[PDB]
Amino acid sequence: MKDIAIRGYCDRPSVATGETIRFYVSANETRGTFDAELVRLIHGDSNPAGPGYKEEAIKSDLEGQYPARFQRTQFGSYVEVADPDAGLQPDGAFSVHLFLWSTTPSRGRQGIASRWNDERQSGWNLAIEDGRVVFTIGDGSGATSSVVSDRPLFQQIWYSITGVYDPEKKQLRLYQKSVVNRTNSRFGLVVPLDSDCAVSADATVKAADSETSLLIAGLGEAAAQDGRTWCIAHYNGKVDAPKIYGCALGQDDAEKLSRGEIVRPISRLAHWDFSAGIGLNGIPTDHVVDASGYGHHGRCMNQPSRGSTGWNWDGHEENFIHCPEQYGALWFHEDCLDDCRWEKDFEFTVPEGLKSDFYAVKIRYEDTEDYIPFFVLPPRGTATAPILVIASTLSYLAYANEQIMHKADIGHTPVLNENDVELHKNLSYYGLSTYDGHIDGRGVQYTSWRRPIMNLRPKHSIWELPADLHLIDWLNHNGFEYDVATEHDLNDQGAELLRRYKVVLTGSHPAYQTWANADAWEDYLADGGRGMYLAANGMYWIVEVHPEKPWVMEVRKELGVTAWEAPPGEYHYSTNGRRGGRFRGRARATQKIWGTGMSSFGFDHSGYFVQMPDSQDERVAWIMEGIDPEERIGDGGLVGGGAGGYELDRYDLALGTPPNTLLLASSVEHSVVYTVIPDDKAFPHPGMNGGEHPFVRADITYFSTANGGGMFATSSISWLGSLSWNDYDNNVSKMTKNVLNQFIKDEPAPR
Amino acid sequence: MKDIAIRGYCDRPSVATGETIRFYVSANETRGTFDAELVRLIHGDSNPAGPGYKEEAIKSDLEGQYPARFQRTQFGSYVEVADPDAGLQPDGAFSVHLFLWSTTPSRGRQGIASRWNDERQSGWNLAIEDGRVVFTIGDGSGATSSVVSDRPLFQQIWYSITGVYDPEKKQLRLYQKSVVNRTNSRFGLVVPLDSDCAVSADATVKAADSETSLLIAGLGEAAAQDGRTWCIAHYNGKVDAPKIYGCALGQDDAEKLSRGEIVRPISRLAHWDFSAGIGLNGIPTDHVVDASGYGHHGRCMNQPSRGSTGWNWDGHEENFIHCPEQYGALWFHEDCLDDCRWEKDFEFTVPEGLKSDFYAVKIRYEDTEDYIPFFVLPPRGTATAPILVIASTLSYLAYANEQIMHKADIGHTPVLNENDVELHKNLSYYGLSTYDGHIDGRGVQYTSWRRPIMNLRPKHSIWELPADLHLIDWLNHNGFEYDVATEHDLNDQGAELLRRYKVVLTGSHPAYQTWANADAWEDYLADGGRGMYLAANGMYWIVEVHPEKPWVMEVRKELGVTAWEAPPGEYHYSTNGRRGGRFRGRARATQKIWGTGMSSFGFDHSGYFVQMPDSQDERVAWIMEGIDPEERIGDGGLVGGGAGGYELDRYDLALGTPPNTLLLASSVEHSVVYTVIPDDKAFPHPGMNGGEHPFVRADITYFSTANGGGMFATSSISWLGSLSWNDYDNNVSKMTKNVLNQFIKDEPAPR
Amino acid sequence: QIWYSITGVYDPEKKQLRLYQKSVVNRTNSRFGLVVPLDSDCAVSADATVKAADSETSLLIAGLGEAAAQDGRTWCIAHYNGKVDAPKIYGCALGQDDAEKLSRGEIVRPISRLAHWDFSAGIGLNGIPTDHVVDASGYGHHGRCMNQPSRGSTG
Amino acid sequence: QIWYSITGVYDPEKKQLRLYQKSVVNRTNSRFGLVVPLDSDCAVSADATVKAADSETSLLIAGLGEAAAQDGRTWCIAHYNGKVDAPKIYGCALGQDDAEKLSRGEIVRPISRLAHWDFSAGIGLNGIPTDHVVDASGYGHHGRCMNQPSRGSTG
Amino acid sequence: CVRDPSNYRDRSADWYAFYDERRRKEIIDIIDEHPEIVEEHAANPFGYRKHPSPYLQRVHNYFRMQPTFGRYYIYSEREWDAYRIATILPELGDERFKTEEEAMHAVFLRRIEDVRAEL
């Protein structure tokens, strides 16, 4: 079919003047060259009923031909303990104990702990194959020796597994024992569970040096070429405190290990504590500590979930920073990705005479155009405009590589294209999204910029970079001079970024903010700053950018407008130790800063605004200026079919709308598809729907702040998609143009 | 209409042999005598389509005549600091600083901190009248001086307020200043809030000794007869850290007090820290510590909310046991009631020869029969029957005085009687329920036994004590010899209570349990114990009985099958510093013990069960003994007209149902009004109803445990109501009787 | 200066007072260490003739009440010198196995307690700046330090 | 023994070397306190007349590489004496406002780091019993303490 | 500035007035264009083994969520055998009823008359 043959990404989302961005490109097979050139994105939405696709080409020092090639991607979570000297390949006896929690115990061959080679069958591994636990040694001749558990594992049940090799008796052994209590495992203590065993086997071969690294939750593929060990047989579920001894262990000693007790502490070789480094600021590191004192430190790879519930967890503390001794597990999925680790193809250092706007590098392969978007900032410490436009990159990372077709293998018949069929065909090159879930049933918490985000390209509810190019095209079609920042840069710079501008606009779906973004907006509006919020669902989810990996973003979700909920002890972030669920449950609701906040949502079509009795107040005779007081504000539009639809925010004084807020209009004609969000339901009952409940509405509001500041909010997604209707001649664009011409002037906003 | 003229309560829910219960009775006016006698409750429901009301009279040392009198009820939260020596009535200058978070700031005259007499205008009070903080002193001659603030208070905004009396200038002063931040108040920092004043007035009187106690959140009514001070003008909302200084402050000094600084420490007369006492076990006491070092230790009355959010709460810690210096407030409603403090009219020691069952004292006044239900236990450490019946007392306290008619002032047009209009007519005598809310809008957390509970009475879904009398009448009609415990007693005794009995039968709606109750059930069913769960919605909420006051129950709710939701930083219980929302979110879901857990609720009628293919199984042919496999199980009942309805529990392995569980039947024919509970929802899409979603069903299950144990679950509230249909000739009583005759034998339950 | 765990039992059924002393030294807490052959444990008993009447005073740690409390003040006479760690009162007689379990730092019969004063309740990250002693059992019998004993001592 | 925040910038767009020295004394960290009128702050600049070529050595905190790394071992010659707290390399050219923000402990421009060694990452309740240095910028440029400097020193 | 809570009011109540107006017109159109749902609810007001029509269910979902739903309780004394309709200390009605299905349907008719009386 129309097969995508070229991919790419940036290392960083936003680049100011005088600093360097890199581009990492991969084709399906290593042949040929590819063209590259820089464009300026103006309007991305290629609906023929609207303005059409627009781009401006820039004569840069970036273009030319570059050799296309293929770049392999590691895909799955593990912990790589690098060992060049084969110190974790003992010669005599050795024993491996770990606590295990398998979430898919029958999905193929799954390696738990290994220092293994799989081209030649050499080394040792402790793996899950055929539903059982198998402990194997090999020497490289193709000859192995395995010991297989009598009792297979259960799904999501804690087990304490010891694997013993003993050269004196020439014998492999294996001690499985299930360690459930009232709270940790899938079912509880009322089962008559007999899943303990103690088996043994004859050893014929020795464990040879595998010439790889030790891996948790995976097997080494071949010997490490150029110091990189690939990983193959990935694992799904928790591993708690693995350890290697340099001695054979009995059954009494494995029984003592099963109760959480470090036996023979001079006979250890390694003991990775997964809860070493938990402070009062979470565990913002990808570093795993050898707790024994032999220096065999590890490194988390592709971001497994730190701060997970461990084997000794009883529900008396549910914040991992206050009981780190019961939170020593990593979750280890098989479909994680924080970085594709490709090689750089070309880099670009931004010139001096380049206007701050939305840019992309258009890459032309044989029969495929590919765009790699990035945002160019103004120079550092300056402001080349009176208007700032916040690009909602944290919600670009939320929906990043969102897979609709892959949700059918775990309304209104969703329309797909050639980008989504590559997301389904190559999961391993792209990753998942926070609206998805892993194959274990847990939602994706971590998401990343350093991967090809296939639904971020400008062409083809839209993919939310075209939905911001709506606003960009409206600003360029009028005579407005604007800058561009991102939510990562607002996180970095605080309100100091915002105070350089007379008015800061908002992207079309700003749903995932950090806590410091909310502080920056609050401190900005509290002293003189103006702002527009031309969107809905605007401060719903709390998000933290990772401190060691700033391209990685963490969210953890709960009951609300969600796709998944966090499991029952794990509501706190790894990156900082704070709660961070949704903003409303922290008493920083969206109404408290921006006037309105999330009220209802649905998926079929849109409505239109009807003028409220505050429309005829003369204090807002500047907003409702060239608009007749009997018209429908926003009937017709590119997104859904109207201006008020698909998500809505409402006026609410009980959540923190300022008392002087005026209520200008509200949206009507919403179907029974739309529903009141679960945040508002005490008892659910029928009639909690659109048209049958008074919380299904958008609300256009204005309020003034101190020192000549103000805030205008329109409370719907499709407001920006309605701006170019009827060739820019409608009530939506006239209202938005009135408020933007008022906000950029050299006088206080009215009261 | 009918006017209830006689009221009463016990001091405790349950009494064993040889120990004393005390009955506290109050009439309208002090005249005449009332009769009393002891009855045994058999069947409570007086539906003429059923068995009708049944009881048995008992000769005892109780019956006679007693002088009927009126007994006055103190109503509403406050803090009573006793002061005999008039140490907190200064002769010179004094000042009063406190923080303030008013929720109903325009509901009449509300006293905040006072040492005041309201009969003769003497003492000093800091109060709110006409929306404004008013500082008033008086001398007993009826003449008062008062200073009134310029700015009225905003609702739920934090204010620092300082009232100064200054005899050197003969001047009253008042320093009001608002202390909003991002997280503590109703609206944030973007408002241009101007609610600060420094007013002054002349002192024309002095301050005389009021001869009362110092009252936070209220005013003393009259002089302290018998050492008890009555409180009249009850304040609604938080008060954080009051203090009295023995000097006259300034404006700079009030500005320093506005920031949390304790100025002039040696000049304090009293300083109550409401957060001193918070440890890792919470704050399980009603003691208030004088942090100024003078022994003026207060006492919380009528249970205000310990562990509430203070004025300095930025939302970084949401557990009060871990940051207790930001949790120094106390909510103080006006319609709290934990204890009526009435005088004992008569007492009753249980004789040696008395069977353990449900009992009550029938009081016959002029035209009104009122009952006072209590529970007689077996002797301590023994057991007199092979069947134990658990009376669900904690979910009697949940629904205690549940005021349907009072909810309008905050389906199916609810039916009432004279017990409801007495609740509506005398709110001060009865109190509220955990489904109710306060007048502050926040739902009621603490509920109490020591008060007349009007829907505990056996006559007249039903009031949940007749719903247990359904089971008691079914047991008495057959030849089963049983004992009766309560959930308070299971809380006290542990699994040692349960292990004395072969089978243990759960009540009709056991929805509220403590954590140790579930531990005791799990340790009972794990090791040989047998049980029956004849109900739905069985282990939903977590409850903690108060340690000092074993008649008071705490619950704090959240999103789910709820009426109210806790405000953001106030999720952790005062009595034990532990999370305790729903059981399902603490990884101890109802499936993990009993086999089925909550799936859907509704409020119109009930449905019938349809047998699954596991009903034809040969292992459970003993359950389905007299039942033809083409029948409907329970089509017709005294509750909703069917055996499955009004709340439904389902089978779910992902929540912890044991794997050897056999699914016997399932309920059908549920209306569109049966919604799916908000726990099971990711995105609310239309169709979350009965007849359309696959989660609206009940599930009759059975699983066997170790040592000959087992658990039979029926997943419906109306199952006990369907027992007596067709004059005890139905499928419901045959199934219950088959499983109960199997469970009472000496052989193990079948596997 | 040697740590001991002392239980005193009164039992009206057998009409008997008992007393369980046991020394609990380890490497660091006491005056001398674990190299001594210390035999200072005992378990004695005596016959009871009288009942314990109401003394009309307050409970005192490290002292005896002098006379009955006139105007709510209880004087103190036979003062004590040295540490007392976690005192507790039960409402039941205790055996020797149960006092042995108490000696290892273990709250036996937690529904049979009457009082348990935790001298390390309220230690935060700002020290313990209070003269308040908490009844840890949950019966509300809170105490009050008088004449400032050293909080934050080694137990 | 005074604490200084120091930032050295190379800037090829202007062909300019810069250096931002600023003293960060407080009450407790330095040799003398806040009462001194300490003036030891500078923002100087000069012209870049060469480029930076690959030295073919290792990166050395507290020293200079002697010659090119024969056999993978780099010899260190000009040994520094005294504390170094949290070095970092940025892949861009900073300013004076940005060096002022770095002077306060803020990690400015996190996505532009090339390496950032936290010398305190690894401290647990067992101390820091290792000579590993963690690259806190997420690039695997993990150092290695040689000849045992004093871990757990005052920052 | 914002300095007095009497100058400010919940402006959402403007939209509640507009919403209640359009919702009342919708409901009386549904009742006048479907007059068999009254007979339907008279036959079986609980829906016991015969679930309501979507239009009857829509009229229920309008009635069962208004702030005026707090009127019209059904009262029944313990030593009485009839049902009366309380009205908001309530005011008891005068018309006795044998069964409570009759009382619930009379409350349904009286609510339809009340929603007609406001238009």
Residue numbers in the entry:
A (entry chain A), B (entry chain C): 1 to 410, 416 to 465, 471 to 761
C (entry chain G), D (entry chain E): 156 to 310
E (entry chain D): 8 to 95, 101 to 131
What does the literature reporting this entry say, word for word?
We show that DMFase from Paracoccus sp. strain DMF is a halophilic and thermostable enzyme comprising a multimeric complex of the α2β2 or (α2β2)2 type. The active site consists of a mononuclear iron coordinated by two Tyr side‐chain phenolates and one carboxylate from Glu.
The mutants Y440A and E521A were catalytically inactive. Structures of these mutant enzymes determined by cryoEM show a loss of Fe atoms. In the EM structures of the active site mutants (Y440A and E521A), the interface between the large and the small subunit becomes disordered, thus suggesting a role for the small subunit in the substrate entry pathway.
